[PDB]
Design a protein around this nucleic acid. Structure first.
Lengths: 91, 308, 97, 82, 110, 106, 93, 97, 82
DNA sequence: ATCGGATGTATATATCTGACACGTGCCTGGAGACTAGGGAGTAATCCCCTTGGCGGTTAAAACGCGGGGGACAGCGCGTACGTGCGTTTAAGCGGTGCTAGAGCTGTCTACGACCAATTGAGCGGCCTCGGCACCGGGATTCTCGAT
DNA sequence: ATCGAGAATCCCGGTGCCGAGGCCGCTCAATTGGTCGTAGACAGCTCTAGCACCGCTTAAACGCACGTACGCGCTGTCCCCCGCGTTTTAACCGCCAAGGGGATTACTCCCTAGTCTCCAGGCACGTGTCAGATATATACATCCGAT
């Protein structure tokens, strides 16, 4: 069963290096990540259909981020996304 | 340009053959062979025995023609063999008519539909292109396939005739990609794939040619191995290129004919519509109805059903 | 000088504005308001008239629903006149907040 | 092209008529200010999404389709237009 | 010869899996084709949200003198932040409980 | 001669068009044969229900046309249609006439 | 441009329901958008079941399940009956 | 002969039940009721324990939200008690009919 | 399983739930109303869950199906798989 | 205002223990290279749809000005709901068994595939006479001032 | 509880006006053709998780007694909202003009699906092991009934 358990555990070490997490909380984070993935992917699919475009590119992923995430959270999320894409393209 | 009986009289030779024994207009464009064109009214041109011919018929004669002379007796024999003229169609129609009153009704209006002796290789690949398709398109596909990979023969007007491609050529590199650009669709893979299987796994040409001495059961079995050659295609080849006169191809046309003209329905099968089991049953049904030359009787109704 | 009951004209008004289906809001001031709200997100932005009409219809429907809910809230409080308390309760219960 | 003080454009009779359609019998004085506030909030919420949809399509005007999509995203699903 | 395999998550400096996100997107029939930058963008967004949630949950756990994250801490993290509450207003967290709040007049005479 | 699928299934909504949008809409890479027919039948039933109720409402108001007021009224008076359409506004639809009991004079 | 819609089809249904009733353009637009909305809901849920059961295709039973999930009350029963009748009639060609 | 005043241990245990995160509804009665509800739609349905737990948690969170909104409706009418009228009111604004 | 299981949610359970909800004083007529509300919600969820199970050609109701049916009604639930 | 009795938490400590965290084995999903083609970015165009202006009329907004009626504060009462307690019951807890269905595997009947002819409905263009808003008028019913 | 003046409302017929619908033109959009390869329906088979059942125990329900504080009824007070009349005003409708951008169309190009050939990142699996449950013992926070 494909999951995000080890990745969330990796991120937890970055955030609080000396904090443990229960398996129930691991499952909740897994479900949360799956739900947010489903929301963004589905809404970006709606943008792709609305613009008569058959490719899901980063522009409408960013638009979906701006639509779903709230105000100040959206600015940080879009900043992280642009930073990641620029790093990927440069490297 | 293409010759006509009236323009170059001293270039035609005849073969005794009454219209009741052969109707070119009912055989050449009916999906048996896809290489004949009525370039001029009542005159059909195509490749026969590695050379070009034009054929036209009167009431009791079949007229045939860088040729600069009339066809020789040896060459004319090539034509008789292609149309299997030793087989008397009148005797066959009589028999089928006697055991099937429906055939008798149709046979009154569609006389002269006989079967063509054919080359195994040409027949195999032409029918591999026949599948899920219409005669008009199939004809084009086969023409482009021969122009691209077959030997160049002679040119008449703006038409350049080509011999049928060899196994080695069809098995060549990038043939599939070429045939897809020529519009063969997914059958492009079938052609490439089957040429190689025959050449690299089945023991080349000899394997396909030996089938003519093998039994229908054996032959049909052997062909089903090749990509693009399931039950309908295999039967087509057995009947038209391997001398299996009892082979009966079951397509959509014979599916409808059985249903509306004989009120036929599967009994041993489980499905109520076309399936590998029902198709096989329909074939036996026709075999028990018409006999040893059931495939030839099939050719008559198929040709007649095209005229709708 | 004959004068009506202070509430009867109000109920007449209820029946009149629940019978028909006109807009009840002047178009041009609403359009000006919409453009004023829109200028802060993106300056020099044009509007299609159908979009403005859609906005006006949706806003009218939302306000009518909100007023119905806050009327229920006021009635539940053994009252007739609506209060901002009622509106804030309607928004809290609905979940907009 | 600056627009200032247009929230007052939502006149008191218009709010009265909307409340009448909602079946309200008596209206207090603070209701007008409260409903101006909630209308401003709701229009900001809708126009944010509508302008993002317009900006995505590389268009410089807000079509009705964008408003319909923005409303359907929030859970309004207005029929008719488009 | 091949120049050794390095994951795109390392290429973009992410911890969340870029390739897994790409696979889910393409087999999630969300569109006919999937762009190259979209999986990286979405993985980064998911990583940022997870980092925010985990940071707030860790703060809540520290304030409760437990070193292990439990769903009660997740509930406090989600509903003690205004924006996160708005983002996840329509979700129920199992074993999460409810934040503590009491209305004013319920409190007794001062 | 061609015999269209809608008439073959005794439906008016175009089965072919529903099938085209089902394929193009990217819902799954393969769409079964009977699913567009089932969808078209469901759409027929819903449209028939809403138009018969709208026509009844229109004749109630001595009106030979259907207007958005008629559609909104028909939707709101019916129960199951209201539940299906509980989160929708109708443009130019108005509101169902409803006056609370305590607002009436004594 | 060729803007497609269900206007003529809704008109055909109207003629077999109320033969002597007209209809306005605004009502036609509302009806077309209603058809589009119901179509999109049902298709979305039908495709959603396909993922939930790991099915790679949409058959006539996913549509029925989606209708049973969406349509409340007697609409579900009658729509299921109508769909079953329609698919049976189509198969029995 | 010592007694706490009404509304003191009533005001308490609110802190206790908001502090805890347990279920507050007995498992077996909820099991029986869920099976009873299930037998109407289909006869003899099997239920995983996880399914019953998920149903219990969902219903309990729903009821907690409903009781919060009921408390809001009750506090609105200058009442500290809650009456069923509050429940129909909260359901009516929430759109649950 | 057969009958009279709605009394399984006794008065103290409802009292405890209301205490968690921030309720101080509960009238007598609350328990019957909330029992009815719980019945309505449970059947509205169970209908969809059993529909999911029946479409799955199963006879056992999984937690996963209950989660999905809850997601259909807008009450997303976390912690029982995705 | 205040004070200790008494509950009810807060705080600290010893002592298990089973979820948590870690290393390990292994394979399958991820990655690198390479290729073909079509989705998409870009330039030119036109036309049309939006913005802006200008002016005349008037429906409607603003505003003052009563006055009654509804919001609201205060007081009483009696009853319905809390707190506490002895008693009952049934809900967990723990086994033990039964087994019917859940889930994974191994065979062969319904769709995708290529796409070009083939109509044939489906939409655009364009009348056209009728449904209905509006007016003009008169009669009906509701409403509040009077007894 | 009626009478009745008066105002809002309902019914009937004429008028004209634009739009719903019918008809024609033209055009792309389902439909199908000499099927075969291939995924899902179905039977097979294991094994496990769900069902039933019983006994023990004790925590929860509950039936009951009792007191009290809350909801509700009732009252007078007063302030403020509504109906109404008069006074601005800027909304609206009609008309006109100018041009910005949004569909379009043609063109190219390069980004990505697909595929072949690997390989290590991450998923079962097993095992130490300590954060937390848990019992025990003390510290103090706060209601509260007098005082």
């Amino acid at each position: 069963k494909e999951s995000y358990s080890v990745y969330v555990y990796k991120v937890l070490k970055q955030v609080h290096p000396d904090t443990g997490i229960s398996s129930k909380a691991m499952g909740i984070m897994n479900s949360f990540v799956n739900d947010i993935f489903e929301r963004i992917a589905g809404e970006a699919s709606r943008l792709a259909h609305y613009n008569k475009r058959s490719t899901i590119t980063s522009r409408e992923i960013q638009t979906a981020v701006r639509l779903l995430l709230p105000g100040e959270l959206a600015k940080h999320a879009v900043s992280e996304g642009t930073k990641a894409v620029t790093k990927y393209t440069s490297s | 340009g293409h010759r006509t009986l009236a323009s170059t009289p001293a270039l035609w030779a005849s073969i005794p053959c009454p219209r009741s024994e052969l109707r070119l207009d009912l055989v050449l464009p009916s999906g048996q062979s896809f290489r004949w064109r009525e370039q001029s009214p009542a005159h059909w041109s195509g490749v026969l025995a590695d050379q070009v011919w034009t054929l036209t018929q009167t009431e009791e004669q079949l007229h045939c023609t860088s040729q600069a002379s009339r066809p020789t007796p040896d060459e004319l024999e090539a034509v008789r063999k292609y149309f299997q003229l030793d087989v008397t169609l009148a005797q066959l129609y009589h028999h089928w008519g006697s055991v099937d009153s429906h055939f008798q009704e149709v046979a009154q209006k569609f006389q002269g539909v006989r079967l063509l002796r054919q080359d195994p290789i040409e027949c195999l690949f032409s029918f591999i292109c026949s599948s899920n398709n219409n005669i008009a398109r199939i004809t084009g596909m086969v023409e482009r396939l021969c122009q691209a990979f077959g030997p160049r023969l002679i040119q008449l007007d703006d038409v350049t005739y080509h011999g049928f491609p060899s196994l080695q050529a069809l098995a060549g590199p990038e043939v599939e990609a070429h045939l897809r650009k020529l519009g063969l669709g997914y059958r492009a893979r079938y052609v490439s794939a089957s040429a190689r299987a025959i050449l690299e796994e089945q023991g080349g040409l000899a394997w396909l040619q030996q089938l003519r001495e093998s039994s229908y059961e054996e032959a049909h079995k052997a062909l089903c191995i090749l990509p693009g050659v399931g039950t309908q295609v295999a039967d087509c080849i057995c009947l038209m290129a391997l001398d299996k006169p009892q082979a009966v191809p079951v397509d959509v046309h014979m599916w409808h004919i059985a249903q509306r003209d004989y009120s036929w329905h599967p009994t041993t099968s489980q499905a109520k519509g076309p399936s590998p089991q029902t198709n096989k049953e329909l074939g036996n049904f026709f075999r028990s109805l018409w006999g040893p030359y059931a495939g030839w009787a099939q050719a008559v109704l198929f040709s007649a059903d095209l005229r709708q | 000088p004959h004068r009506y009951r202070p509430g009867t004209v109000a109920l007449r008004e209820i029946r009149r504005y629940q019978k028909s289906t006109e807009l009840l809001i002047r178009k041009l001031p609403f359009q000006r308001l919409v453009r004023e709200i829109a200028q802060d997100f993106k300056t020099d932005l044009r509007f299609q008239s159908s979009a403005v009409m859609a906005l006006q219809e949706a806003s009218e429907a939302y306000l009518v629903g909100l007023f119905e809910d806050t009327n229920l809230a006021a009635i539940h409080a053994k009252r007739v006149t609506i209060m901002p308390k009622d509106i804030q309760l309607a928004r809290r219960i609905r979940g907009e907040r | 092209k600056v627009l200032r003080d247009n929230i007052q454009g939502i006149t008191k009779p218009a709010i009265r008529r909307l409340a009448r359609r909602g079946g309200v019998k008596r209206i207090s004085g603070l209701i007008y200010e409260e409903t101006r506030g909630v209308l401003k909030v709701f229009l900001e919420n809708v126009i944010r999404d509508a302008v993002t949809y317009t900006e995505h399509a590389k268009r410089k005007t807000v079509t009705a389709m964008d408003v319909v999509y923005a409303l359907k995203r929030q859970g309004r699903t207005l029929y008719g237009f488009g | 010869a091949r120049a050794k395999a390095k994951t795109r998550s390392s290429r973009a400096g992410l911890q969340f899996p870029v390739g897994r996100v790409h696979r889910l997107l393409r087999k999630g029939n969300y569109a006919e084709r999937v762009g190259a930058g979209a999986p990286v963008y979405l993985a980064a967004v998911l990583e940022y949200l997870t980092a925010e949630i985990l940071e707030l949950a860790g703060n809540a756990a520290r304030d409760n003198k437990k070193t292990r994250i439990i769903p009660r801490h997740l509930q406090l993290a989600i509903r003690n932040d205004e924006e996160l509450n708005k983002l996840l207003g329509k979700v129920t967290i199992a074993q999460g409980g409810v934040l503590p709040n009491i209305q004013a007049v319920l409190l007794p005479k001062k």
